[PDB]
Every structure is written in C-alpha cells, then in structure tokens.
Amino acid sequence: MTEYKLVVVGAGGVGKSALTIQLIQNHFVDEYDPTIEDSYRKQVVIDGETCLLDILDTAGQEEYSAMRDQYMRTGEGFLCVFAINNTKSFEDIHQYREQIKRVKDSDDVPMVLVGNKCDLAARTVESRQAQDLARSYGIPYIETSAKTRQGVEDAFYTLVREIRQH
C-alpha cells in the first residue's frame, strides 16, 4: 500500500516524541526520556485512503549530527517542531529547514511548521510570528498540544496531504 515516510525534527525537548506517541498510542508521556532514534509504523485510513505511516522520531541533541543526513535524505515529509514557550527552539527552526534543503537538493520539500505545547500559558513565541515565518517558507503552520491532543492528527494528516500534492 501507499507508504508515507515522515520525519519529526526539532530541538531537544520540544515534544517530538510526545506528539508521535499521542498519535500512535493515544496517550501523553510526561517523563524525561531523550530520544536517540525511534521508528513507528501505523496503518491509517486518511481521506478514504488506506496507508502506512512510517514515522521516524529523531534526536534533539546535536551530538547526532551524523544520523541526520541519512533520514533527512530518505524522508518524504517533515514535521518541523518547536515549543511555543522556548524562543530558542523557534530560532533553530531555520537551521533544520536549511539542512533538509541541502541534503535533498530541493527548495520545495513537503513540510509543516508545528508550534507544540500550546496548552501552556507562559508563551514566549507569538502566534502571528510563527505564522509569518510559515508564510515565507510557503508551508502550513499548526499549533499543537501533545498533552490535550489538540491539532495532533491535524499536523500529521496535513503533512500527508502536502506529500500527495507535490
């Protein structure tokens, strides 16, 4: 069947795994568990299409700058995640996008900007800001919460639809 190779990238601790786990196991992981490299395969019916979501959950730590080129090269769609309460994670975003473009020799790669942890009150990154960024990249922006599950499916399915169009 149609497989979609999605990769979740972003700075450490922004909630890449939490998002993935919510989509897969439908439950919020509230524990410190740094990722080295994890893979998840889930069958889903999206817009009537039976497909396999092959998701690669990556590490936020730079010590693994090598494993990057590999998966970035084989990925079809990328969820670029940052946390709305971590300005730094928002700034690192462009670096991940740039690495993706250089590794694939393409300026138009299926991507979605995701502002996670939208359930917290101490927001340091204005929504219009991330949205302005997304607008310049020509990619969709979606705020999510792995805790309450808001936008979770929204983010993954939009990416999938972005892949269908390209």
Ligand X SMILES: Nc1nc2c(ncn2[C@@H]2O[C@H](COP(=O)(O)OP(=O)(O)NP(=O)(O)O)[C@@H](O)[C@H]2O)c(=O)[nH]1
Work out whether 107 is an interface residue with ligand X (CB under 6 A). Answer: no
CA distances from residue 89 to 15, 52, 104, 106, 152 in whole angstroms, order as listed? 11, 29, 23, 24, 19
Tell whether residue 34 is among the known ligand binding residues.
yes
The stretch near ligand X (CB under 6 A) out of 69-77, 98-106, 115-123, 128-136 is 115-123
Query: Between residue 12 and residue 31, which ones bind Mg ion under the rule CB under 5 A?
Result: 16-17
Name 92's Cβ contacts closer than 8 Å, sequence gap at least 6.
10, 11, 82
Tell whether residue 118 is among the known ligand binding residues.
yes
Q: Where are the beta strands (DSSP E) in the chain?
A: 2-9, 37-46, 49-58, 77-83, 111-116, 141-143
Query: Which of Mg ion, ligand X, none interacts with 30 (beta carbon under 5 to 8 A by kind)?
Result: ligand X
Site residues (vs ligand X, CB under 6 A): 12-18, 29-30, 32-35, 59-60, 116-117, 119-120, 145-147
For the annotated binding site for GTP, the residues are 13-18, 29-35, 59-60, 116-119, 145-147
